[PDB]
Design an enzyme around this catalytic site. Structure first.
Site, PDB file in Angstrom:
ATOM      1  N   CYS A 106      -3.882 -16.697  72.717  1.00 19.14           N
ATOM      2  CA  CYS A 106      -4.391 -17.205  71.453  1.00 19.14           C
ATOM      3  C   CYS A 106      -3.438 -18.223  70.823  1.00 19.14           C
ATOM      4  CB  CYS A 106      -4.536 -16.025  70.490  1.00 19.14           C
ATOM      5  SG  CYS A 106      -5.367 -16.395  68.973  1.00 19.14           S
ATOM      6  N   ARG A 109      -2.137 -17.824  66.512  1.00 20.25           N
ATOM      7  CA  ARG A 109      -1.393 -16.655  66.020  1.00 20.25           C
ATOM      8  C   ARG A 109      -0.490 -16.909  64.813  1.00 20.25           C
ATOM      9  NH1 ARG A 109       1.312 -14.668  71.346  1.00 20.25           N
ATOM     10  NH2 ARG A 109       0.760 -16.819  72.108  1.00 20.25           N
ATOM     11  N   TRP A 278     -11.702 -18.160  63.050  1.00 23.25           N
ATOM     12  CA  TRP A 278     -12.477 -19.380  62.908  1.00 23.25           C
ATOM     13  C   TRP A 278     -12.202 -20.290  64.106  1.00 23.25           C
ATOM     14  CZ3 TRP A 278      -8.439 -18.347  59.254  1.00 23.25           C
ATOM     15  CH2 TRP A 278      -7.261 -19.072  59.468  1.00 23.25           C
ATOM     16  N   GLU A 283     -13.442 -25.705  71.374  1.00 21.58           N
ATOM     17  CA  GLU A 283     -14.188 -24.565  71.893  1.00 21.58           C
ATOM     18  C   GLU A 283     -15.701 -24.815  71.904  1.00 21.58           C
ATOM     19  OE1 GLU A 283     -12.652 -20.483  70.801  1.00 21.58           O
ATOM     20  OE2 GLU A 283     -11.878 -21.599  69.001  1.00 21.58           O
TER      21      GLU A 283
HETATM   22  C1  HEM Z   1      -7.850 -17.633  62.899  1.00 21.10           C
HETATM   23  C2  HEM Z   1      -8.240 -18.546  63.798  1.00 21.10           C
HETATM   24  C3  HEM Z   1      -8.122 -18.327  65.318  1.00 21.10           C
HETATM   25  C4  HEM Z   1      -8.022 -19.353  66.167  1.00 21.10           C
HETATM   26  C5  HEM Z   1      -8.013 -20.867  65.752  1.00 21.10           C
HETATM   27  C6  HEM Z   1      -7.955 -18.803  67.513  1.00 21.10           C
HETATM   28  C7  HEM Z   1      -7.839 -19.533  68.659  1.00 21.10           C
HETATM   29  C8  HEM Z   1      -8.037 -19.057  69.937  1.00 21.10           C
HETATM   30  C9  HEM Z   1      -8.401 -19.843  71.111  1.00 21.10           C
HETATM   31  C10 HEM Z   1      -8.679 -21.370  71.151  1.00 21.10           C
HETATM   32  C11 HEM Z   1      -8.448 -19.015  72.150  1.00 21.10           C
HETATM   33  C12 HEM Z   1      -8.851 -19.310  73.610  1.00 21.10           C
HETATM   34  C13 HEM Z   1     -10.312 -18.865  73.580  1.00 21.10           C
HETATM   35  C14 HEM Z   1     -11.184 -19.429  74.659  1.00 21.10           C
HETATM   36  O1  HEM Z   1     -10.916 -20.580  75.128  1.00 21.10           O
HETATM   37  O2  HEM Z   1     -12.156 -18.683  75.011  1.00 21.10           O
HETATM   38  C15 HEM Z   1      -8.145 -17.709  71.668  1.00 21.10           C
HETATM   39  C16 HEM Z   1      -8.091 -16.594  72.431  1.00 21.10           C
HETATM   40  C17 HEM Z   1      -7.834 -15.352  71.907  1.00 21.10           C
HETATM   41  N1  HEM Z   1      -7.504 -15.035  70.589  1.00 21.10           N
HETATM   42 FE1  HEM Z   1      -7.608 -16.205  69.054  1.00 21.10          FE
HETATM   43  N2  HEM Z   1      -7.899 -17.413  67.418  1.00 21.10           N
HETATM   44  C18 HEM Z   1      -8.047 -17.090  66.063  1.00 21.10           C
HETATM   45  C19 HEM Z   1      -8.180 -15.793  65.575  1.00 21.10           C
HETATM   46  C20 HEM Z   1      -7.973 -14.650  66.349  1.00 21.10           C
HETATM   47  C21 HEM Z   1      -7.918 -13.292  65.835  1.00 21.10           C
HETATM   48  C22 HEM Z   1      -8.233 -12.870  64.350  1.00 21.10           C
HETATM   49  C23 HEM Z   1      -7.563 -12.526  66.888  1.00 21.10           C
HETATM   50  C24 HEM Z   1      -7.379 -11.017  66.943  1.00 21.10           C
HETATM   51  C25 HEM Z   1      -7.671 -10.307  65.860  1.00 21.10           C
HETATM   52  C26 HEM Z   1      -7.389 -13.347  68.054  1.00 21.10           C
HETATM   53  C27 HEM Z   1      -7.054 -12.943  69.326  1.00 21.10           C
HETATM   54  C28 HEM Z   1      -7.365 -13.643  70.490  1.00 21.10           C
HETATM   55  C29 HEM Z   1      -7.472 -13.046  71.792  1.00 21.10           C
HETATM   56  C30 HEM Z   1      -7.288 -11.549  72.183  1.00 21.10           C
HETATM   57  C31 HEM Z   1      -7.797 -14.188  72.742  1.00 21.10           C
HETATM   58  C32 HEM Z   1      -8.040 -14.158  74.281  1.00 21.10           C
HETATM   59  C33 HEM Z   1      -9.489 -13.737  74.563  1.00 21.10           C
HETATM   60  C34 HEM Z   1      -9.830 -13.821  76.033  1.00 21.10           C
HETATM   61  O3  HEM Z   1      -9.041 -13.356  76.910  1.00 21.10           O
HETATM   62  O4  HEM Z   1     -10.929 -14.375  76.336  1.00 21.10           O
HETATM   63  N3  HEM Z   1      -7.627 -14.622  67.697  1.00 21.10           N
HETATM   64  N4  HEM Z   1      -7.822 -17.756  70.334  1.00 21.10           N
HETATM   65  C1  LIG Z   2     -14.554 -13.224  82.077  1.00 16.93           C
HETATM   66  C2  LIG Z   2     -13.743 -13.416  80.817  1.00 16.93           C
HETATM   67  C3  LIG Z   2     -12.486 -12.811  80.679  1.00 16.93           C
HETATM   68  C4  LIG Z   2     -11.738 -12.995  79.506  1.00 16.93           C
HETATM   69  N1  LIG Z   2     -10.512 -12.420  79.337  1.00 16.93           N
HETATM   70  N2  LIG Z   2     -12.257 -13.767  78.517  1.00 16.93           N
HETATM   71  C5  LIG Z   2     -13.467 -14.378  78.614  1.00 16.93           C
HETATM   72  C6  LIG Z   2     -13.942 -15.214  77.431  1.00 16.93           C
HETATM   73  C7  LIG Z   2     -14.413 -16.632  77.776  1.00 16.93           C
HETATM   74  C8  LIG Z   2     -13.254 -17.555  78.135  1.00 16.93           C
HETATM   75  N3  LIG Z   2     -13.606 -18.842  77.548  1.00 16.93           N
HETATM   76  C9  LIG Z   2     -14.865 -18.835  76.833  1.00 16.93           C
HETATM   77  C10 LIG Z   2     -15.115 -17.346  76.620  1.00 16.93           C
HETATM   78  O1  LIG Z   2     -14.518 -16.962  75.380  1.00 16.93           O
HETATM   79  C11 LIG Z   2     -15.475 -16.849  74.337  1.00 16.93           C
HETATM   80  C12 LIG Z   2     -14.753 -16.322  73.114  1.00 16.93           C
HETATM   81  N4  LIG Z   2     -14.320 -17.450  72.329  1.00 16.93           N
HETATM   82  C13 LIG Z   2     -13.965 -17.274  70.943  1.00 16.93           C
HETATM   83  C14 LIG Z   2     -12.438 -17.281  70.844  1.00 16.93           C
HETATM   84  F1  LIG Z   2     -11.977 -16.180  71.401  1.00 16.93           F
HETATM   85  F2  LIG Z   2     -11.918 -18.244  71.560  1.00 16.93           F
HETATM   86  C15 LIG Z   2     -12.006 -17.451  69.397  1.00 16.93           C
HETATM   87  C16 LIG Z   2     -11.840 -18.703  68.808  1.00 16.93           C
HETATM   88  C17 LIG Z   2     -11.445 -18.825  67.489  1.00 16.93           C
HETATM   89  C18 LIG Z   2     -11.221 -17.662  66.752  1.00 16.93           C
HETATM   90  C19 LIG Z   2     -11.406 -16.416  67.340  1.00 16.93           C
HETATM   91  F3  LIG Z   2     -11.250 -15.212  66.744  1.00 16.93           F
HETATM   92  C20 LIG Z   2     -11.784 -16.334  68.626  1.00 16.93           C
HETATM   93  F4  LIG Z   2     -11.921 -15.102  69.081  1.00 16.93           F
HETATM   94  C21 LIG Z   2     -14.238 -14.206  79.775  1.00 16.93           C
END
Ligand code: HEM
Ligand SMILES: Cc1cc(N)nc(C[C@@H]2CNC[C@@H]2OCCNCC(F)(F)c2cccc(F)c2F)c1
Ligand code: HEM
Ligand SMILES: Cc1cc(N)nc(C[C@@H]2CNC[C@@H]2OCCNCC(F)(F)c2cccc(F)c2F)c1
Ligand SMILES: C[C@H](O)[C@H](O)[C@H]1CNc2nc(N)[nH]c(=O)c2N1
Ligand SMILES: C[C@H](O)[C@H](O)[C@H]1CNc2nc(N)[nH]c(=O)c2N1
Ligand SMILES: [Zn+2]
Lengths: 407, 411
Positions: A106, A109, A278, A283
């Site tokens: 993320c 953070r 947000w 994305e």
């Molecule tokens: C506040 C604004 C936030 C922004 C701008 C943001 C941004 C992002 C982005 C760009 C990613 C990569 C997601 C992707 O490409 O699918 C990501 C992943 C992630 N973020 Fe955030 N995040 C935010 C809030 C949060 C919050 C509130 C949490 C936890 C409470 C969090 C935890 C995570 C986790 C666990 C992932 C990895 C998910 C996965 O493996 O697919 N984020 N974040």
């Molecule tokens: C198979 C698989 C495994 C894994 N660990 N994650 C995925 C998620 C897949 C990996 N890229 C696309 C899809 O993410 C969608 C969730 N996107 C929202 C966000 F997480 F990025 C996000 C963005 C901004 C604020 C947030 F709180 C937030 F949660 C898929």
């Protein structure tokens, strides 16, 4: 054992000590790097409990104090009696925030400490789940002025009494496979959209149909609910100079809310724990709109920009990719729904790395995920070495429940 | 033991068995991944295993494994090692070695081309002047009036490590950079120190923005000597844009020949410390990094100024917009002048088919994702969505420290 990270743009060098407190395994060995792979009893629990509570009491300036020792004993006695234990509210809030502090994927953070935690551990049915989820969505959305929040349902027990939100996000568009051959709406959710209808969802069969939540309580069969439409804030996408952009009929939802992950705190597993923040603009603009397996709109867009699509080298994809992302950011801003661009968000993350290095000894970060999917090297995270390691409490990926639920 | 990579865009799954023939450390552990860290005299005892491994490989490939030819060459090499402490590669081993170093280069997106490499054997070279001449011939052959051809020139191997051949330049053709008393740089900021060594060493500097550095060349452990490459051998392309007529008035150009000269070629345990090699540019190496890194030419502001972009808020994406125009310009310019160049869409797509082919024919393809994915437009190139295993095969190209840090000066 005292590893260094260099930024190649600014020559700033940071010293990581935090990684020796790393617990879980990464996927890599000294023989093979798996940096780019998407997915690499009573005895077990108490040390995990101990590990977590030690860090908690450390963080509140009370390591080795009577209150500290008392809790370790209380927790030990509960495990030995029940097969598990319960977190105090304060422990639970700390755990949640720290799981966000530890998500090495993320970029967002810098915000970790500002997380509203909604303790749904008294929930017992799926209707209760719906209620809690509605309240989350409304609080977090806040009429466009988005606020980070997480909602924590009851921890795993014997493991066939699991709570799960079957949707991967709270708010997502439907996908239907057509007689035509192409896909209508979002191709990423076809599978889930089928399972919805099979459970009785009356699909409207459109390109932007907000899915119904499927909720499972206490290991029971999953049930369907529609999120009050007045709760799902959406944004029509227009371009600040391209008048014709609106005619693609694009909209996106304001609230990203990941709902299929598993929160582990001090050995306890919270299998339903949707959280939301947000969007970073890329994305939606880069991934949701332009990926080949998604809405895949580049061709349509390039065609209206009257770009030369004759050869790859005119970079028509690249030109069109930018304007799409300009349009995403512009629309959200004009509608006052919180959104951050990839420049600002990566710049925030570098400050946040530097803060965690001086204040914690490090910051786990997964370069493959932190660097935006467009314009990588002109954002400062591209030039930044990162070490990736797994700390607890954490968010973990978990199997789709349908691959595992007994009906 | 098998390993699987998935493509998340196409759901193709590949199986890697090649990683089982893997040697060097990655830098990673089960506890830490260092997949994004830029940087992750050999005794008699340690050499015959490495020689044998290499020669089993070579002989496998030429379909002669276990032949008399194979057994005699093993024995012969053994003897050389125990008599002289080193050994000499046959021409055919050198060629094969150097083709495979490229094939094993996990950070190289251009590898579909690996089997077409022109190897220049320069193992009879004894002096710097000798190196100069070899290098000029390399430059001229590789340039081929714009129809670029991949080549490498191989100078004698390391002996006791006191007699090393080195090309102090990081690339044979690169522009100078001159730090000014005001704090700003003229030319390429990345070559200030080295440019300084050149001036220190007697080079008379034009002090312009695109001055081609002189080669600094060390032979047999001696102090290095200066040489201007002949300018008629230095192909350059002036940078213009197909729609924007003001672009040429930025005054930019770039050299056509990318030729890395600071790496060490390891074959069968032998170490070639001077093995400059070259192919042809991917547009983004010039247009994104060379032109737009903040610590390089840094032209993004000037370009967006001319385009009249809204530059008051990052969210206008003015940086992203100016970046693409520049990249359009580099590719337009190279193509108009008939100089070989590949764009990133084309380069990654080629790479994905090479990788796939390698998996079938060879049981894998080590690939470093951090380097393979281009530095703009990441996810609309198919490499983005492709899982990749990174591991180290020999023969290989290694980073080595800069010579000025190591060299014992003779006087
Ligand atoms: C506040 C604004 C936030 C922004 C701008 C943001 C941004 C992002 C982005 C760009 C990613 C990569 C997601 C992707 O490409 O699918 C990501 C992943 C992630 N973020 Fe955030 N995040 C935010 C809030 C949060 C919050 C509130 C949490 C936890 C409470 C969090 C935890 C995570 C986790 C666990 C992932 C990895 C998910 C996965 O493996 O697919 N984020 N974040
Ligand atoms: C198979 C698989 C495994 C894994 N660990 N994650 C995925 C998620 C897949 C990996 N890229 C696309 C899809 O993410 C969608 C969730 N996107 C929202 C966000 F997480 F990025 C996000 C963005 C901004 C604020 C947030 F709180 C937030 F949660 C898929
Ligand atoms: C066909 C022309 C070629 C193209 C377009 C190409 C493409 C690339 C690119 C874009 C990079 C990374 C660039 C960077 O960030 O510095 C690279 C790295 C590399 N390539 Fe190639 N390549 C080509 C030919 C070759 C040849 C002929 C060799 C040697 C025989 C080679 C070996 C390497 C090595 C060792 C690296 C990593 C260098 C380092 O660590 O700095 N490539 N390739
Ligand atoms: C600290 C450090 C470590 C390392 N392993 N490489 C470098 C070299 C760094 C890595 N990106 C910037 C600098 O390379 C400049 C030259 N690159 C040319 C090329 F390799 F990309 C290339 C491109 C196309 C054809 C070729 F033959 C070719 F060799 C630096
Ligand atoms: C820190 C990081 O490893 C470094 O900036 C890398 C990222 N990816 C790269 N990729 C290529 N092709 N060339 C580079 O110089 C770099 N730089
Ligand atoms: C195979 C590769 O790991 C995969 O494409 C990853 C790369 N980086 C990513 N980065 C982010 N932020 N989100 C993603 O979904 C992905 N996908
Ligand atoms: Zn790794």
């Amino acid at each position: 054992r005292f590893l260094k990270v260099k930024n190649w743009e600014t020559d700033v060098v940071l010293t990581d000590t935090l990684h020796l407190k790393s617990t879980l395994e990464t996927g890599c060995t000294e023989h093979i790097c798996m940096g780019s792979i998407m997915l690499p009893t009573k005895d077990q629990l108490f040390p995990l409990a101990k590990e977590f509570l030690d860090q908690y009491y450390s963080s509140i300036k009370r390591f080795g104090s009577k209150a500290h020792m008392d809790r370790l004993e209380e927790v030990n006695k509960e495990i030995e009696s029940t097969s598990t234990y319960q977190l105090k509210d304060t422990e639970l809030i700390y755990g949640a925030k720290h799981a966000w502090r530890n998500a090495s994927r993320c970029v967002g953070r810098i915000q970790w400490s500002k997380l509203q935690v909604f303790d749904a551990r008294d929930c017992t049915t799926a209707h209760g789940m719906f209620n809690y989820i509605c309240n989350h969505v409304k609080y977090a959305t806040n009429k466009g002025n988005l606020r980070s929040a997480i909602t924590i349902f009851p921890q795993r027990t014997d493991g066939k009494h699991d709570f799960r939100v079957w949707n991967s996000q709270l708010i997502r568009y439907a996908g239907y496979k057509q007689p035509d051959g192409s896909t209508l709406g979002d191709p990423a959710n076809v599978q889930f959209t089928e399972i919805c209808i099979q459970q009785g969802w009356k699909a409207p069969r459109g390109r932007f149909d907000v899915l119904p939540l499927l909720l499972q309580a206490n290991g029971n069969d999953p049930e369907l609910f529609q999120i009050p439409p007045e709760l799902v804030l959406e944004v029509p996408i227009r371009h600040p100079k391209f008048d014709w952009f609106k005619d693609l009929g694009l909209k996106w939802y304001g609230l990203p809310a990941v709902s299929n992950m598993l929160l582990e705190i001090g050995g306890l597993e919270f299998s339903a724990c949707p959280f939301s923040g947000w969007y970073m603009g890329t994305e939606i603009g880069v991934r949701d709109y332009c990926d080949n397996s998604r809405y895949n709109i580049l061709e349509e867009v390039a065609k209206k920009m009257d770009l030369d699509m004759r050869k790859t080298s005119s970079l028509w994809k690249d030109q069109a990719l930018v304007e799409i992302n300009i349009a995403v950011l512009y629309s959200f801003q004009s509608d006052k729904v919180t959104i951050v661009d990839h420049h600002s968000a990566t710049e925030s993350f570098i400050k946040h790395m530097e803060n965690e290095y001086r204040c914690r000894g490090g910051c786990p970060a997964d370069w493959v995920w932190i660097v935006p999917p467009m314009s990588g090297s002109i954002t400062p995270v591209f030039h930044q070495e990162m070490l990736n390691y797994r700390l607890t409490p954490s968010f973990e990926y978990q199997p789709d429940p349908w691959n595992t639920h007994v009906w």
